[PDB]
Design a protein around this ligand. Structure first.
Ligand code: CL
Ligand code: CL
Ligand code: ZN
Lengths: 327, 81
Protein backbone atom coordinates (compact mmCIF):
# COMPACT_ATOMS: atom_id res chain seq x y z
CA UNK A 1 0.00 0.00 0.00
CA UNK A 2 1.38 3.35 -1.04
CA UNK A 3 1.50 6.87 0.38
CA UNK A 4 0.04 5.82 3.72
CA UNK A 5 2.68 7.57 5.92
CA UNK A 6 1.82 9.53 9.07
CA UNK A 7 3.19 12.99 9.83
CA UNK A 8 4.47 13.82 13.29
CA UNK A 9 2.77 16.69 15.02
CA UNK A 10 5.49 19.23 15.90
CA UNK A 11 3.47 21.25 18.34
CA UNK A 12 0.03 22.50 17.15
CA UNK A 13 0.94 21.54 13.49
CA UNK A 14 -2.07 19.40 12.70
CA UNK A 15 -3.23 22.16 10.35
CA UNK A 16 0.00 21.70 8.40
CA UNK A 17 -0.21 17.84 8.30
CA UNK A 18 -3.88 17.96 7.11
CA UNK A 19 -3.04 20.18 4.17
CA UNK A 20 0.17 18.30 3.38
CA UNK A 21 -1.79 15.01 3.07
CA UNK A 22 -4.41 16.69 0.92
CA UNK A 23 -1.56 17.89 -1.30
CA UNK A 24 0.20 14.50 -1.20
CA UNK A 25 -2.96 12.92 -2.63
CA UNK A 26 -3.34 15.59 -5.32
CA UNK A 27 -2.29 13.23 -8.03
CA UNK A 28 -0.68 15.57 -10.58
CA UNK A 29 1.00 17.70 -7.88
CA UNK A 30 2.35 14.50 -6.21
CA UNK A 31 3.61 13.35 -9.65
CA UNK A 32 5.30 16.70 -10.36
CA UNK A 33 7.25 16.03 -7.11
CA UNK A 34 8.01 12.29 -7.59
CA UNK A 35 9.13 12.82 -11.22
CA UNK A 36 11.25 15.79 -10.01
CA UNK A 37 9.74 17.92 -12.77
CA UNK A 38 10.12 21.02 -10.50
CA UNK A 39 13.95 20.87 -11.12
CA UNK A 40 13.29 21.95 -14.68
CA UNK A 41 11.16 24.92 -13.49
CA UNK A 42 13.42 26.30 -10.73
CA UNK A 43 15.52 29.09 -12.18
CA UNK A 44 18.54 28.81 -9.87
CA UNK A 45 19.64 27.02 -6.70
CA UNK A 46 18.20 27.57 -3.26
CA UNK A 47 19.93 28.48 -0.01
CA UNK A 48 18.80 27.72 3.56
CA UNK A 49 16.11 30.46 3.50
CA UNK A 50 14.61 29.63 0.10
CA UNK A 51 14.37 25.83 -0.39
CA UNK A 52 10.51 25.63 -0.04
CA UNK A 53 9.87 23.64 -3.27
CA UNK A 54 12.90 21.42 -2.55
CA UNK A 55 11.75 20.51 0.98
CA UNK A 56 8.07 20.20 -0.01
CA UNK A 57 9.02 17.79 -2.92
CA UNK A 58 11.31 15.77 -0.65
CA UNK A 59 8.50 15.34 1.97
CA UNK A 60 6.22 14.15 -0.82
CA UNK A 61 8.88 11.75 -2.08
CA UNK A 62 9.37 10.42 1.45
CA UNK A 63 5.62 9.90 1.98
CA UNK A 64 5.39 7.99 -1.40
CA UNK A 65 8.38 5.73 -0.60
CA UNK A 66 7.24 4.82 2.94
CA UNK A 67 5.81 1.49 4.18
CA UNK A 68 2.31 1.72 5.70
CA UNK A 69 2.33 3.15 9.27
CA UNK A 70 5.78 4.74 8.85
CA UNK A 71 5.67 8.21 10.58
CA UNK A 72 7.54 10.99 8.67
CA UNK A 73 8.83 14.20 10.30
CA UNK A 74 8.03 17.41 8.32
CA UNK A 75 10.31 19.53 10.53
CA UNK A 76 12.59 20.49 7.65
CA UNK A 77 9.63 21.50 5.50
CA UNK A 78 8.21 23.59 8.42
CA UNK A 79 11.51 25.46 8.67
CA UNK A 80 11.20 26.47 4.99
CA UNK A 81 7.49 27.44 5.05
CA UNK A 82 8.03 29.71 8.17
CA UNK A 83 11.03 31.32 6.44
CA UNK A 84 8.83 32.16 3.46
CA UNK A 85 5.89 33.11 5.60
CA UNK A 86 6.91 34.11 9.15
CA UNK A 87 3.44 33.91 10.61
CA UNK A 88 4.18 30.15 10.79
CA UNK A 89 7.22 30.54 13.11
CA UNK A 90 6.73 28.72 16.36
CA UNK A 91 4.04 26.41 17.62
CA UNK A 92 0.63 28.14 17.72
CA UNK A 93 -2.38 26.56 15.91
CA UNK A 94 -3.14 28.07 12.60
CA UNK A 95 -5.81 27.99 10.02
CA UNK A 96 -5.45 25.30 7.29
CA UNK A 97 -6.75 27.52 4.47
CA UNK A 98 -4.43 30.33 5.46
CA UNK A 99 -1.53 27.82 5.38
CA UNK A 100 -2.73 26.47 2.00
CA UNK A 101 -2.73 29.97 0.53
CA UNK A 102 0.77 30.82 1.71
CA UNK A 103 2.26 27.44 0.82
CA UNK A 104 0.87 27.44 -2.74
CA UNK A 105 1.93 31.06 -3.15
CA UNK A 106 5.56 30.20 -2.23
CA UNK A 107 5.59 27.04 -4.37
CA UNK A 108 4.18 28.94 -7.34
CA UNK A 109 6.57 31.86 -7.03
CA UNK A 110 9.53 29.55 -6.95
CA UNK A 111 8.47 27.58 -10.11
CA UNK A 112 6.89 30.53 -11.95
CA UNK A 113 7.76 30.27 -15.67
CA UNK A 114 7.57 34.08 -15.74
CA UNK A 115 11.03 35.22 -14.56
CA UNK A 116 10.66 39.00 -14.95
CA UNK A 117 7.01 40.08 -14.48
CA UNK A 118 5.57 42.91 -16.80
CA UNK A 119 4.44 46.22 -15.13
CA UNK A 120 -4.34 48.06 -17.66
CA UNK A 121 -6.57 48.93 -20.68
CA UNK A 122 -10.10 49.57 -22.01
CA UNK A 123 -11.70 46.37 -23.31
CA UNK A 124 -15.26 47.65 -23.77
CA UNK A 125 -15.16 46.92 -27.49
CA UNK A 126 -14.80 43.22 -26.77
CA UNK A 127 -17.56 40.66 -26.21
CA UNK A 128 -17.45 39.23 -22.63
CA UNK A 129 -15.80 35.89 -23.49
CA UNK A 130 -13.08 37.56 -25.45
CA UNK A 131 -12.51 40.15 -22.66
CA UNK A 132 -12.16 37.15 -20.28
CA UNK A 133 -9.60 35.52 -22.59
CA UNK A 134 -7.59 38.75 -22.76
CA UNK A 135 -7.67 39.13 -18.99
CA UNK A 136 -6.54 35.51 -18.63
CA UNK A 137 -3.68 36.15 -21.06
CA UNK A 138 -2.68 39.21 -19.04
CA UNK A 139 -2.71 37.23 -15.77
CA UNK A 140 -0.57 34.48 -17.36
CA UNK A 141 2.02 37.16 -18.36
CA UNK A 142 2.74 37.52 -14.64
CA UNK A 143 1.73 34.14 -13.17
CA UNK A 144 2.34 30.97 -15.08
CA UNK A 145 3.41 27.75 -13.34
CA UNK A 146 2.68 24.05 -12.97
CA UNK A 147 1.06 24.83 -9.66
CA UNK A 148 -1.26 27.41 -11.28
CA UNK A 149 -1.89 24.90 -14.12
CA UNK A 150 -3.68 22.86 -11.49
CA UNK A 151 -5.52 25.24 -9.09
CA UNK A 152 -6.25 28.46 -11.02
CA UNK A 153 -9.62 29.39 -12.50
CA UNK A 154 -11.30 32.64 -13.38
CA UNK A 155 -14.49 34.13 -11.84
CA UNK A 156 -16.60 36.63 -13.82
CA UNK A 157 -18.38 39.27 -11.76
CA UNK A 158 -21.24 41.13 -13.53
CA UNK A 159 -22.34 44.37 -11.94
CA UNK A 160 -25.53 45.80 -13.46
CA UNK A 161 -26.87 49.29 -12.75
CA UNK A 162 -30.64 49.12 -12.09
CA UNK A 163 -30.97 52.61 -13.52
CA UNK A 164 -29.12 52.80 -16.89
CA UNK A 165 -28.88 48.98 -17.29
CA UNK A 166 -25.10 49.03 -17.91
CA UNK A 167 -23.44 45.72 -16.89
CA UNK A 168 -19.75 46.13 -16.01
CA UNK A 169 -17.86 42.85 -16.06
CA UNK A 170 -14.55 42.06 -14.36
CA UNK A 171 -12.67 38.75 -14.39
CA UNK A 172 -10.72 37.83 -11.20
CA UNK A 173 -8.35 34.80 -11.09
CA UNK A 174 -8.94 32.43 -8.18
CA UNK A 175 -7.01 29.55 -6.63
CA UNK A 176 -9.86 28.38 -4.40
CA UNK A 177 -13.42 29.48 -3.66
CA UNK A 178 -14.54 30.38 -0.15
CA UNK A 179 -18.24 29.56 -0.10
CA UNK A 180 -20.96 30.78 2.25
CA UNK A 181 -22.96 28.36 4.38
CA UNK A 182 -26.46 28.60 2.77
CA UNK A 183 -29.99 28.11 4.22
CA UNK A 184 -32.40 22.49 7.57
CA UNK A 185 -30.59 20.05 4.99
CA UNK A 186 -27.85 22.21 3.36
CA UNK A 187 -26.07 20.87 0.27
CA UNK A 188 -22.88 22.03 -1.29
CA UNK A 189 -24.87 22.98 -4.39
CA UNK A 190 -26.98 25.34 -2.14
CA UNK A 191 -23.75 26.95 -0.96
CA UNK A 192 -22.50 27.43 -4.54
CA UNK A 193 -25.93 28.81 -5.54
CA UNK A 194 -25.68 31.35 -2.68
CA UNK A 195 -22.12 32.25 -3.73
CA UNK A 196 -23.21 32.94 -7.34
CA UNK A 197 -26.71 34.39 -6.61
CA UNK A 198 -27.73 37.89 -7.86
CA UNK A 199 -26.80 40.07 -4.90
CA UNK A 200 -28.65 43.39 -4.67
CA UNK A 201 -26.36 46.14 -3.50
CA UNK A 202 -28.41 48.91 -1.97
CA UNK A 203 -28.46 51.32 0.99
CA UNK A 204 -24.93 51.91 2.35
CA UNK A 205 -23.70 49.29 -0.22
CA UNK A 206 -24.95 51.17 -3.38
CA UNK A 207 -21.98 51.27 -5.75
CA UNK A 208 -21.29 54.38 -7.88
CA UNK A 209 -22.44 53.73 -11.45
CA UNK A 210 -19.63 54.64 -13.89
CA UNK A 211 -22.33 55.92 -16.37
CA UNK A 212 -24.98 57.58 -14.14
CA UNK A 213 -22.11 59.16 -12.16
CA UNK A 214 -23.95 58.73 -8.79
CA UNK A 215 -24.71 56.00 -6.18
CA UNK A 216 -27.22 53.47 -7.62
CA UNK A 217 -28.76 50.11 -6.56
CA UNK A 218 -26.84 47.50 -8.56
CA UNK A 219 -27.08 43.74 -8.94
CA UNK A 220 -23.72 41.89 -8.64
CA UNK A 221 -23.48 38.18 -9.72
CA UNK A 222 -20.69 35.71 -10.08
CA UNK A 223 -20.23 32.97 -12.65
CA UNK A 224 -17.22 30.75 -13.43
CA UNK A 225 -15.40 31.76 -16.61
CA UNK A 226 -12.66 29.08 -16.32
CA UNK A 227 -12.82 25.97 -14.17
CA UNK A 228 -9.56 24.83 -12.57
CA UNK A 229 -8.35 21.20 -12.85
CA UNK A 230 -8.25 21.04 -9.04
CA UNK A 231 -11.06 22.94 -7.35
CA UNK A 232 -10.58 23.76 -3.70
CA UNK A 233 -13.75 24.72 -1.86
CA UNK A 234 -13.31 26.47 1.46
CA UNK A 235 -16.51 26.57 3.61
CA UNK A 236 -16.89 29.87 5.60
CA UNK A 237 -17.64 28.18 8.97
CA UNK A 238 -17.65 31.62 10.72
CA UNK A 239 -20.92 32.82 12.30
CA UNK A 240 -22.02 36.43 12.99
CA UNK A 241 -21.39 37.18 16.67
CA UNK A 242 -17.09 35.41 16.45
CA UNK A 243 -17.45 31.62 16.53
CA UNK A 244 -17.49 28.45 14.41
CA UNK A 245 -20.50 27.60 12.27
CA UNK A 246 -20.90 23.86 12.54
CA UNK A 247 -23.58 23.24 9.96
CA UNK A 248 -23.65 19.90 8.22
CA UNK A 249 -23.02 20.64 4.52
CA UNK A 250 -23.89 17.68 2.30
CA UNK A 251 -21.18 17.50 -0.39
CA UNK A 252 -21.02 14.66 -3.01
CA UNK A 253 -18.01 12.36 -3.32
CA UNK A 254 -18.49 12.11 -7.10
CA UNK A 255 -20.32 14.03 -9.79
CA UNK A 256 -20.27 17.54 -8.42
CA UNK A 257 -21.71 19.10 -11.53
CA UNK A 258 -21.03 22.86 -11.72
CA UNK A 259 -22.19 23.44 -15.26
CA UNK A 260 -25.09 25.67 -13.97
CA UNK A 261 -22.50 28.20 -12.69
CA UNK A 262 -20.48 28.38 -15.86
CA UNK A 263 -20.37 31.72 -17.67
CA UNK A 264 -20.83 29.84 -20.97
CA UNK A 265 -22.85 26.62 -21.52
CA UNK A 266 -16.28 20.15 -18.38
CA UNK A 267 -17.36 21.30 -14.96
CA UNK A 268 -17.90 17.83 -13.37
CA UNK A 269 -15.71 17.00 -10.35
CA UNK A 270 -14.93 14.09 -8.08
CA UNK A 271 -13.78 14.55 -4.45
CA UNK A 272 -10.36 13.27 -3.44
CA UNK A 273 -9.50 14.98 -0.10
CA UNK A 274 -11.05 16.76 2.82
CA UNK A 275 -9.41 18.87 5.48
CA UNK A 276 -11.54 18.53 8.71
CA UNK A 277 -11.49 20.91 11.73
CA UNK A 278 -12.99 19.55 14.93
CA UNK A 279 -13.61 21.52 18.09
CA UNK A 280 -13.86 25.07 19.18
CA UNK A 281 -12.94 28.06 16.99
CA UNK A 282 -9.64 28.12 19.03
CA UNK A 283 -8.16 24.89 20.44
CA UNK A 284 -9.50 22.62 17.74
CA UNK A 285 -7.84 19.82 15.85
CA UNK A 286 -7.25 19.10 12.15
CA UNK A 287 -7.37 15.74 10.31
CA UNK A 288 -7.62 14.81 6.57
CA UNK A 289 -9.63 12.18 4.75
CA UNK A 290 -7.87 11.34 1.46
CA UNK A 291 -8.60 9.02 -1.47
CA UNK A 292 -5.47 7.32 -2.61
CA UNK A 293 -4.89 8.11 -6.37
CA UNK A 294 -3.88 4.47 -7.06
CA UNK A 295 -6.42 2.41 -5.13
CA UNK A 296 -9.39 4.76 -4.72
CA UNK A 297 -9.72 3.70 -1.09
CA UNK A 298 -10.10 6.41 1.61
CA UNK A 299 -7.88 6.75 4.66
CA UNK A 300 -8.03 9.05 7.67
CA UNK A 301 -4.76 10.84 8.27
CA UNK A 302 -4.57 12.11 11.78
CA UNK A 303 -1.00 13.33 12.42
CA UNK A 304 0.96 10.08 13.00
CA UNK A 305 -2.02 7.74 12.64
CA UNK A 306 -3.22 6.59 9.14
CA UNK A 307 -6.26 4.33 9.24
CA UNK A 308 -8.65 2.93 6.69
CA UNK A 309 -12.20 4.25 6.39
CA UNK A 310 -15.21 3.64 4.29
CA UNK A 311 -16.19 6.25 1.72
CA UNK A 312 -19.48 6.48 3.72
CA UNK A 313 -17.55 8.06 6.62
CA UNK A 314 -16.03 10.91 4.49
CA UNK A 315 -18.93 13.35 4.71
CA UNK A 316 -19.14 14.98 8.14
CA UNK A 317 -19.96 18.37 9.62
CA UNK A 318 -16.22 18.96 10.34
CA UNK A 319 -15.31 19.19 6.65
CA UNK A 320 -13.68 22.62 6.08
CA UNK A 321 -11.75 22.34 2.83
CA UNK A 322 -12.94 20.18 -0.01
CA UNK A 323 -10.46 19.12 -2.72
CA UNK A 324 -12.18 18.27 -6.04
CA UNK A 325 -10.52 17.05 -9.26
CA UNK A 326 -12.10 17.37 -12.75
CA UNK A 327 -13.72 13.97 -13.70
CA UNK B 1 -19.85 69.54 2.48
CA UNK B 2 -18.52 65.99 3.07
CA UNK B 3 -15.06 64.36 2.70
CA UNK B 4 -15.01 62.80 -0.79
CA UNK B 5 -15.77 59.11 -1.43
CA UNK B 6 -12.87 56.95 -2.63
CA UNK B 7 -12.05 57.25 -6.34
CA UNK B 8 -12.46 53.51 -6.89
CA UNK B 9 -14.85 50.95 -5.55
CA UNK B 10 -14.18 47.35 -4.70
CA UNK B 11 -16.34 44.65 -3.09
CA UNK B 12 -15.82 42.35 -0.24
CA UNK B 13 -17.59 39.01 -0.09
CA UNK B 14 -18.60 38.75 3.57
CA UNK B 15 -19.01 35.81 5.86
CA UNK B 16 -22.66 35.14 4.62
CA UNK B 17 -21.72 35.55 0.93
CA UNK B 18 -23.36 38.98 0.50
CA UNK B 19 -21.17 41.82 -0.73
CA UNK B 20 -20.25 45.12 0.78
CA UNK B 21 -18.96 48.00 -1.35
CA UNK B 22 -15.82 49.88 -0.22
CA UNK B 23 -14.71 53.30 -1.21
CA UNK B 24 -10.95 53.10 -1.67
CA UNK B 25 -7.85 54.41 -3.42
CA UNK B 26 -5.07 52.41 -5.08
CA UNK B 27 -2.78 53.71 -2.35
CA UNK B 28 -4.90 52.36 0.53
CA UNK B 29 -3.13 49.73 2.62
CA UNK B 30 -4.60 46.40 3.54
CA UNK B 31 -4.91 47.71 7.15
CA UNK B 32 -7.06 50.59 5.88
CA UNK B 33 -9.16 48.05 3.98
CA UNK B 34 -9.55 45.90 7.11
CA UNK B 35 -10.61 49.06 9.04
CA UNK B 36 -13.34 49.66 6.45
CA UNK B 37 -14.52 46.08 6.83
CA UNK B 38 -14.54 46.55 10.57
CA UNK B 39 -16.87 49.62 10.05
CA UNK B 40 -19.32 47.67 7.91
CA UNK B 41 -19.22 44.15 9.46
CA UNK B 42 -18.04 44.67 13.08
CA UNK B 43 -15.20 42.13 12.68
CA UNK B 44 -11.91 43.01 14.36
CA UNK B 45 -9.10 43.64 11.87
CA UNK B 46 -6.92 41.09 13.71
CA UNK B 47 -9.38 38.29 12.85
CA UNK B 48 -9.87 39.24 9.15
CA UNK B 49 -8.11 37.55 6.18
CA UNK B 50 -8.69 38.80 2.67
CA UNK B 51 -8.15 36.61 -0.37
CA UNK B 52 -7.74 37.96 -3.95
CA UNK B 53 -6.34 35.99 -6.93
CA UNK B 54 -5.18 33.28 -4.47
CA UNK B 55 -3.15 35.75 -2.43
CA UNK B 56 -3.84 36.48 1.18
CA UNK B 57 -3.42 40.29 1.35
CA UNK B 58 -0.80 41.37 3.84
CA UNK B 59 -0.69 44.41 6.11
CA UNK B 60 1.82 47.02 4.93
CA UNK B 61 0.98 46.50 1.26
CA UNK B 62 -1.39 48.60 -0.80
CA UNK B 63 -4.24 47.66 -3.20
CA UNK B 64 -1.95 48.83 -5.96
CA UNK B 65 0.71 46.32 -4.89
CA UNK B 66 -1.67 43.51 -5.74
CA UNK B 67 -2.95 45.20 -8.93
CA UNK B 68 -6.46 45.15 -7.50
CA UNK B 69 -8.65 47.18 -9.83
CA UNK B 70 -12.17 48.60 -9.94
CA UNK B 71 -14.97 46.23 -9.01
CA UNK B 72 -12.71 43.33 -8.06
CA UNK B 73 -13.87 41.27 -5.11
CA UNK B 74 -11.86 40.49 -1.99
CA UNK B 75 -12.94 37.32 -0.19
CA UNK B 76 -13.26 37.74 3.57
CA UNK B 77 -12.60 34.64 5.75
CA UNK B 78 -11.65 34.25 9.45
CA UNK B 79 -9.75 31.32 11.08
CA UNK B 80 -10.34 27.92 12.57
CA UNK B 81 -7.56 27.17 15.00
CL1 CL C 1 -24.49 18.98 -3.47
CL1 CL D 1 -1.27 40.52 7.55
ZN1 ZN E 1 -26.11 53.53 -14.26
Amino acid sequence: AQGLAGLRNLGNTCFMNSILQCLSNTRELRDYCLQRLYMRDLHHGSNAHTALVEEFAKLIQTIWTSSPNDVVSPSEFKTQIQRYAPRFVGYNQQDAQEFLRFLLDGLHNEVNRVTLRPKPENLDHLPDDEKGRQMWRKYLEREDSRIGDLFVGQLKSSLTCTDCGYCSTVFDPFWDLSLPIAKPEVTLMDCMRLFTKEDVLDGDEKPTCCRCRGRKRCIKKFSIQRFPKILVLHLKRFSESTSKLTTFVNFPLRDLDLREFASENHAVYNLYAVSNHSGTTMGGHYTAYCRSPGTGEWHTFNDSSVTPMSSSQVRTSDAYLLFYELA
Amino acid sequence: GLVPRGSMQIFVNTLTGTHITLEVEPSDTIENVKAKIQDKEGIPPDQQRLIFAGKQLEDGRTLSDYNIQKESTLHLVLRLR
